[PDB]
Write a protein that binds this DNA or RNA. Structure first.
Lengths: 48, 137, 141, 49, 97, 523, 74, 216, 48
RNA sequence: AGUGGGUAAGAGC
């Protein structure tokens, strides 16, 4: 991620890359955000 | 290929291996697995007859409102009708003489080289850390 | 709109999809007189030349070419379809309808990003590509 | 320690000698909005001074 | 007074309407410029704006109930933007932790 | 009486007054009658049947129609029972769940047919003998008062809640009249006329929506941010069309793109406020393009001055809309500035000689009265020649204290700053040379920060001149504080934050000798 | 120069020729009477037997569509 | 009464040649046959005008190549080129265009010109800033009368007596007025309480709005 | 839907022989009667 | 109150 901050990327590529810290943040807060109470509705299990 | 008619007895949905989709059931006609077409005409005539309660009245009202709106705001082609008519006097040679549009800006602006990015010099972090130190006196 | 090429029958659309082996085909399904279709037409024409290398633009009037309306759900005022090597490509735009772009996008940069992401994903053999920008919210504030 | 408005920490600041010759810094900070593309929430005070 | 040393006058403070409009505009441009932006950047921008407003206009917030309403509204706007960023669906009982 | 019944009274009165006030005369109509052309068509037959039989038949027919609509795409995993409750037959996949979504109209129809099923079922139960006529009336009243609880059809049209809140109100209007004397509170009332008519009056208005929706849905063939981009494109098309109509296209087809390029170039030239004159362009074509450009410019100005005012009011706007509007406003402001500068140059300075003399004489008198010494040129042997340069360089460098990435302009600026910092004497020599000789400078860019209330100008200056200007500002301010050029009332000073300025202003107002006096009329 | 002329000849017409643009403008004008023409009808109406059958994208109906197209022959 | 004081002071007689125009998007043969159908032919209509409306020509809308940003200036005769058979005016009515060309018949003893400013465009109202260059001393109007009516007239020389100027945008403008004193020949410009003596040289250097001329 | 609900029998009735317009294929059935009532009699019945 | 904005794509059997 740090090495990709400057590698002559396109707008779509850099825009997608800017969301990696968001992914880390969501993963760090998974036991709370990914809870039945906060998000009511049907739960789907992952494939594996 | 452009400008070529379709072959006879060819399904454009077929001939490509394409497969459609259904995002929902509310959109698209019902999927299907001469006393039939003569009922649709009767139902349509029924609907038209029932819609004719105020159809002429409201269409006349809509026409009047459209004319009132266009009174102050003419149609776009109307605003150019006079100039359009004056365009008829142009000879074919004068049509031939219109020049191709050129772009004034040079290469450095049309197709600039990639604007590379560089990290902030370490001197900035050095200055930030050196600042904040406090004299004991 | 009128600047972009137009396809008059479904067979021409099939030929256009088949004849492209290394470029993503972007087809705008709708009516040239529709204002939303007009926005799609003007954006596409603005970026019809920038993405010429890895894309191509075709315009199809679903009134004169209704042959896909049943199969492709061509009933929104304006839809955008992406194909690569005779294979329709889906985009996880975030709106819940990955099959097509059924709304008008104002920014041409967003559409260039969409086309490039589609090309990248479909070149790798994938059939669904994740859109670079989420569209579940118009971000109006 | 952190009571006076010209905070006592400024007396013990590292660059307390070179800051004394920085005059009219509030006006410069206020006018900085005409040079930098980003609005400054602290347009009114300087952390160093 | 500096002579009588008495409470001759009472000064009531309030946050100016232009300042409230500027703060709302700053929060609006923070939020609308967040299509492709990390959550931490948005939260840091909001925190900076909030500390600037509260430190500059301390003692003037309390009398400006409209400013309190605007502040809590903008904070809810920020939280809603972050929650939409996480998942494209509003949580029902989202926690503040 | 309790609060709830009173609020029911005011709510009923509110609805009645709204109905009365917004009443309009019925529109003239040609008297086309339903159920009269049906018997005319060779598809309908007339008879006379018991009402309960017809209700059961209609319930069955509605169930059959809803079942036919459910199995529209041969998706046979959505079971609809005979009480009009729709449920999946199993744990349907997420793809199926997305594929089995029905609009609010379908569920409104399902719930309304459920309500009719409840009514007809109550009638059937009375006919069988399970419930007395009093019990039938009570059940019908409970149905018409508890539609929201029994059906929940408000979930697919929330305006329907207006009916429900009315019906409940009617209940509170009736019960406290019904259960007044020796009769206590209980489920004995059966006065169902009010709720019945309320729901019928909802039906008379909800019928067209469902009718047209099902007519389009069951038909053989299915059918199905534009303010700014409405006039512009069409305008271009119109103009283009006109030209191609009078262009002998059979001989000059190749010139369509040339014409469009000319149109775009003229629009760009007007937008950039630069002269535009195609030499070989025909005069009628030039007139065409000029009129098109004038119309487009009027639309562009109106759109800009409409969107800006919408944004100022706090309206919810997109992000690209704000960027486009800011660009348009910058172009408009720069055109206005060009006109203003040209007017100033053509009409000469607006300050008259006598006014200038008065101003200058006032300044001279002030300076002489204050014993002010003019600021000297920075000498080659200035004691503080280095501290000022260091402070100016620090101020210039604080522009990138947080910038994680730097483009070419920023890195060139940083390189110039560091080069001046490594060799302070050379930097000072260049500063002095520029002060003494430099009079012409490079072009400075202009941008506008949008605060949604005003457009603040931001100016981009070359770093080479920026360092000189920064040092000059630092030196000038140091001198102006060395010799008190600025009297104390000039603000803000380096001693008080603006809140401290406000506090000091209040304290000075209070500390005036007898300032809060009104006995003798002083103000 | 050779590679420049080869890449110039390697281009494909991104935009339609003059005839296509003129025809497209004629078609748009015939529909957008609010911008053109003399009579102002609705947005998409031209004023002022055989119905084509289209596949639904289902493989089950492929044969039915094929035989319908065969019956569509002259 | 047929001839009131206002009628004999300002009213004049003028002639309009109104010719109906077919739809420009018509075949040439169809246009010719419609013209021969006696409906799209010229018709002469006499009328009485209290004043003459002067239509300012279109603004350049672009910077001058040599001396950029020059305010347009038009001679008075080009505006006066109206009201004669040689020049037409295609009125672009929203229904259909009209080919109306005017012609003066009987000049009033006193003439009122109204320069058309504040023209509402398709979206708002803008003020045309084009300046008209005229000889303040005298103007000749005998050349803008038909040969039939030039025998009666003997005095067609007009001198400017009153001038109206609008300064500023249409939203907020100021109406200044120059008046010629008959006794001294001096021009005086008065705006609200302000009264000043103005040289006749720079009278034409303003956005003239209403002009009052005397035939002498 | 509307026809039978507006023609639904009143609580003092048992059987309501109402006219019916029914589709020849049994698709739909309209209660082809407008519930006309003499208003003083109707109000008196409801008071009873 | 409420529907959604929650379809992994791919290989032939």
């Amino acid at each position: 991620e740090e090495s990709m901050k400057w590698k002559k990327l396109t707008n779509a590529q850099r825009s997608g890359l800017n969301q990696i810290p968001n992914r880390r943040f969501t993963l760090w807060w998974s036991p709370t955000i990914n809870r039945a109470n906060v998000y009511v509705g049907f739960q789907v299990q992952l494939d594996l | 290929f452009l400008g070529m008619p379709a072959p006879l007895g060819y399904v454009p949905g077929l001939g490509r291996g394409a497969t459609g989709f259904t995002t929902r059931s509310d959109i698209g006609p019902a999927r299907d697995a001469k006393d039939d077409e003569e009922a649709d005409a009767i139902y349509a005539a029924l609907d038209k007859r029932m819609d004719e309660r105020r159809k002429e009245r409201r269409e006349q009202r809509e026409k009047e409102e459209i004319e009132k709106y266009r009174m102050e705001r003419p149609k776009i082609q109307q605003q150019f009708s006079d100039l359009k008519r004056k365009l008829a006097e142009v000879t074919e040679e004068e049509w031939l003489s219109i020049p191709e549009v050129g772009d004034a800006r040079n290469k450095r602006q049309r197709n600039p080289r990639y604007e590379k990015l560089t990290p902030v010099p370490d001197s900035f972090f050095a200055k930030h850390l050196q600042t904040g130190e406090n004299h004991t006196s | 709109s009128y600047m972009l090429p137009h396809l008059h029958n479904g067979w021409q659309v099939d030929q256009a999809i088949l004849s492209e082996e290394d470029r993503v085909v972007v087809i705008r399904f709708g009516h040239d007189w529709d204002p939303t279709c007009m926005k799609m037409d003007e954006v596409l024409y603005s970026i019809a030349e920038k993405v010429k290398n890895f894309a191509v633009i075709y315009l199809v009037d679903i009134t004169e070419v209704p042959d896909f309306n049943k199969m492709y759900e061509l009933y929104d005022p304006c839809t955008v379809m992406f194909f690569f090597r005779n294979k329709h490509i889906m985009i996880d735009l975030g709106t819940g309808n990955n099959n097509k772009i059924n709304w008008a996008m104002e920014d041409k940069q967003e559409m260039v990003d969409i086309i490039e992401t589609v090309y990248r994903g479909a070149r790798k053999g994938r059939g669904l590509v994740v859109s670079p920008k989420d569209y579940s919210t118009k971000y109006r504030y | 320690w952190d009571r006076g408005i010209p905070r006592i920490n400024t007396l013990f600041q590292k660059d307390r000698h070179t800051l004394a010759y920085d005059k009219g810094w509030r006006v410069r900070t206020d006018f900085k909005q005409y040079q930098v593309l980003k609005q400054n929430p602290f347009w009114w005070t300087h952390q160093r001074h | 007074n500096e002579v009588t040393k008495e409470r001759t006058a009472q000064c009531f403070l309030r946050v100016d309407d232009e300042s409230m409009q500027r703060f709302h505009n700053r929060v609006r441009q923070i939020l609308m410029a967040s299509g492709s932006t990390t959550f931490t950047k948005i939260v840091n921008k909001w925190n900076t704006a909030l500390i600037g407003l509260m430190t500059y206009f301390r003692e003037a917030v309390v009398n400006t109930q409209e400013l309190l309403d605007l502040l809590v509204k903008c904070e809810n706007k920020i939280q809603t933007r972050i929650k939409i960023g996480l998942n494209s669906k509003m949580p029902s009982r989202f926690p503040p932790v | 009486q309790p609060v709830k019944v009173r609020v029911s009274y005011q709510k009923l009165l509110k609805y009645y007054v709204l109905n009365a006030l917004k009443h309009r005369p019925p529109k003239a109509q040609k008297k086309r009658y339903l159920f009269r052309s049906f018997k005319a068509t060779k598809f309908f037959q007339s008879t006379k049947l018991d009402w309960v039989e017809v209700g059961l038949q209609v319930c069955r027919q509605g169930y059959n129609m809803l079942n036919l609509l459910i199995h529209r795409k041969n998706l046979n995993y959505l079971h609809l029972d005979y009480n009009f409750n729709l449920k999946p037959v199993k744990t349907l996949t997420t793809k199926e769940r997305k594929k089995s979504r029905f609009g609010n109209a379908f569920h409104l129809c399902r719930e309304v047919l459920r309500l009719t099923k409840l009514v007809v079922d109550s009638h059937v139960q009375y006919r069988l003998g399970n419930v007395d006529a009093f019990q039938l009336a009570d059940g019908l009243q409970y149905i018409f008062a508890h539609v929201g609880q029994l059906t929940g059809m408000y979930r697919y049209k929330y305006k329907l809640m207006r009916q429900i809140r009315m019906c409940k109100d009617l209940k509170h209007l009736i019960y406290y009249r019904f259960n007044t004397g020796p009769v206590g509170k209980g489920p004995g009332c059966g006065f169902w006329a009010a709720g019945w008519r309320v729901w019928l009056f909802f039906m008379r208005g909800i019928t067209p929506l469902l009718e047209r929706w099902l007519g389009n849905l069951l038909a053989r063939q299915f059918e199905g941010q534009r303010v700014e981009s409405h006039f512009d494109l069409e305008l271009r098309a119109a103009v283009m069309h006109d030209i191609l109509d009078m262009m002998p296209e059979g001989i000059k087809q190749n010139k369509a793109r040339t014409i469009l390029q000319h149109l775009s170039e003229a629009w760009r030239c007007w937008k950039a406020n630069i002269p535009w004159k195609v030499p070989g362009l025909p005069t009628p074509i030039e007139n065409m393009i000029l009129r098109y450009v004038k119309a487009k410019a009027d639309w562009w100005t109106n759109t800009a001055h409409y969107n800006r005012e919408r944004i100022r009011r706090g309206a919810t706007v997109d992000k690209t809309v704000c960027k486009k509007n800011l660009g348009r406003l910058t172009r408009l402001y720069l055109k206005a500035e060009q006109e203003r500068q040209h007017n100033y140059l053509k009409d000469g300075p607006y300050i008259t000689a006598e006014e200038a003399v008065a101003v200058y004489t006032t300044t001279v008198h002030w300076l002489e009265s204050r014993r002010f010494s003019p600021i000297p040129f920075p000498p080659l042997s200035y004691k503080h020649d280095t501290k000022l340069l260091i402070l100016a360089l620090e101020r210039l460098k604080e522009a990138y204290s947080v910038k994680s990435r730097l483009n070419q302009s920023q890195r060139e600026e940083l390189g110039l700053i560091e080069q001046a910092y490594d060799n302070p004497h050379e930097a000072l020599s260049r500063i002095k040379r520029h002060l003494l000789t430099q009079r012409a400078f490079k072009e400075v860019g202009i941008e506008f920060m949008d605060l949604y209330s005003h457009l603040v100008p931001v100016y981009d200056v070359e770093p080479l001149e920026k360092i000189t200007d920064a040092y000059l500002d630092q030196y000038l301010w140091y001198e102006a504080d060395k010799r008190r050029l600025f009297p104390p009332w000039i603000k803000p000073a380096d001693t008080e934050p603006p809140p401290l300025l406000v506090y000091k202003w209040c304290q000075g107002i209070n500390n005036l000798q007898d300032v809060w006096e009104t006995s003798e009329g002083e103000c | 120069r050779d590679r420049s002329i080869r890449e110039k000849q390697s281009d494909d017409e991104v935009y339609a020729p003059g005839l296509d643009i003129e025809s497209s403008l004629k078609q748009l004008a015939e529909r957008r009477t609010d911008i053109f023409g003399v009579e102002e009808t609705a947005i998409g109406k031209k004023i002022g037997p055989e119905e084509k059958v289209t596949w639904d994208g289902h493989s089950g109906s492929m044969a039915r569509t094929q035989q319908a197209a065969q019956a569509n022959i002259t | 009464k047929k001839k009131t004081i206002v009628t004999d002071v300002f009213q004049g007689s003028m002639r309009i040649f109104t010719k109906k125009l077919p739809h420009p998007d018509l075949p040439a043969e169809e246009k010719e046959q419609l013209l021969h159908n006696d409906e799209y032919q010229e018709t002469m209509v006499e009328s009485t005008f209290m004043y003459l409306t002067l239509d300012l020509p279109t603004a350049p809308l672009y910077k001058d190549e040599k001396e950029q940003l020059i305010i347009p200036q038009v001679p008075l005769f080009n505006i006066l080129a109206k009201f004669n058979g040689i020049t037409e005016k295609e009125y672009k009515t929203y229904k259909e265009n009209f080919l109306k060309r005017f012609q003066l018949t009987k000049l009033p003893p006193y003439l009122i010109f109204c320069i058309k400013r504040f023209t509402k465009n398709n979206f708002f109202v803008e003020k045309n800033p084009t300046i008209v260059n005229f000889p303040i001393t005298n103007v000749d109007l005998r050349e803008y009368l038909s040969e039939e009516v030039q025998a009666v007239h003997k005095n067609t020389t007009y001198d400017l007596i009153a001038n109206i100027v609008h300064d500023g945008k249409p939203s907020e403008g100021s109406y200044r007025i120059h008046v010629l004193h008959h006794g001294t020949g001096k021009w005086y410009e008065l705006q609200d309480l302000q009264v000043t003596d103005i040289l006749p040289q720079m009278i034409t250097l303003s956005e003239a709005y209403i002009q009052i001329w005397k035939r002498r | 839907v509307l026809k039978l609900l507006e023609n639904m029998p009143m609580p003092w009735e048992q059987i309501r022989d109402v006219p019916v317009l029914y589709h020849i294929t049994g698709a739909i059935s309209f209660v082809n009667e407008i519930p006309w009532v003499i208003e003083p009699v109707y109000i008196s019945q409801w008071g009873s």
